[PDB]
Write a protein that binds this ligand. Structure first.
Ligand SMILES: [Ca+2]
Length: 334
């Protein structure tokens, strides 16, 4: 089995609050984290926002969710978006209150932030397995200072965030991760790291893991073959483990905006297809040197079944019965 078989269920507290509840494969209602734990899932990814006006996914939100994750005996992977809202290649908005005019001040705020985040979990007796300094930062982070017009600033910021973690009171230092999107593209992965490391602002010793997103419905170029090559080269070039930190497969996709990759076009859109995809994906990761695992993204987000894609349903739970699909067992046993 893979070192990590995880799921990002960040939305959980928001759904439970809205009255949502789930049922195991026996139709017995039961806390989602315990349903997942028993199925084999051994790690939970949680997105963390800095100062969202409405509190969604902030530090307190994540503390409540992490408490339950620890209880169920699963590890914790904190996905720091380093923004007050969704962070990705098209939007890396610096937290309100943080600097968009002074790198010195910004580096300090980020260092203080990660230090504080880690310290707060330590004060709540919660260990952190993985923590990513940013989410999909291929186009940089904390704009404008961290735009790709300055890979030096990007490197200096990552260095600062990394050390905020290294300097924290967490008994064991969490694995520090850098996460980029389009994991199937070796050229994009390599350019980011080679360019950022070339400045000396970011040290190879500053981080531990490589994280990549891997989706099948945003481009026919996302073949398992390209992913295999990209993951293979990441480990061989930089000598660090790799992790697929985000992925989905539809149980229903009436009309995709994009053609699916060639080595995936035979997989049907159904629970069964979801299982076949996951096993085929796990195969690539397992066969890669230091391929640590796979994290499904938001398998239980009832009410947002499409999860931002052009497909109809990417969930691993039945949006009518609130009952989890058999695919959870497949993910748990990867
Ligand atoms: Ca997304």
């Amino acid at each position: 089995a893979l070192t990590y078989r995880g799921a990002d269920i960040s939305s959980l507290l928001l759904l439970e609050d809205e009255g949502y509840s789930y049922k195991n494969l026996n139709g017995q209602t039961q806390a989602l984290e315990t349903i997942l734990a028993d199925a084999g899932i051994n790690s939970i990814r949680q997105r963390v926002w800095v100062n969202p006006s409405d509190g969604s996914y902030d530090l307190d939100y994540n503390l409540e969710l992490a408490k339950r994750v620890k209880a169920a005996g699963m590890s914790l992977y904190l996905d720091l978006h380093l923004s007050d809202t969704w962070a990705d290649p098209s939007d890396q908005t610096t937290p309100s209150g943080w600097s968009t005019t002074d790198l010195g001040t910004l580096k300090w705020q980020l260092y203080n932030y990660t230090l504080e985040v880690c310290n707060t979990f330590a004060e709540n007796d919660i260990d952190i397995e993985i923590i990513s300094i940013g989410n999909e930062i291929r186009a940089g982070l904390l704009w404008p200072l961290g735009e790709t017009s300055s890979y030096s600033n990007i490197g200096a910021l990552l260095h600062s965030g990394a050390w905020g973690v290294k300097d924290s009171n967490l008994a064991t230092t969490p694995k520090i991760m850098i996460h980029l999107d389009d994991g199937w593209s070796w050229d994009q992965q390599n350019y980011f790291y080679e360019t950022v490391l070339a400045t000396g602002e970011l040290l190879s010793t500053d981080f531990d893991y490589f994280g990549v997103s891997y989706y099948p419905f945003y481009s026919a170029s996302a073949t398992l073959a390209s992913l295999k090559t990209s993951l293979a080269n990441l480990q061989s070039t930089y000598d660090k483990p790799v992790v697929v930190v985000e992925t989905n497969w539809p149980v229903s996709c009436p009309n995709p905006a994009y053609a699916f990759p060639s080595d995936l076009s035979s997989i049907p859109f159904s629970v069964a297809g979801q299982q076949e995809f996951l096993e085929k994906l796990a195969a690539v990761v397992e066969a890669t040197t230091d391929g640590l695992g796979v994290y499904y993204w938001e398998p239980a987000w009832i009410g947002n079944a499409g999860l931002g894609s052009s497909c109809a349903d990417n969930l691993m739970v039945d949006y009518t019965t609130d009952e989890v699909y058999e695919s959870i067992e497949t993910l748990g046993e990867l």
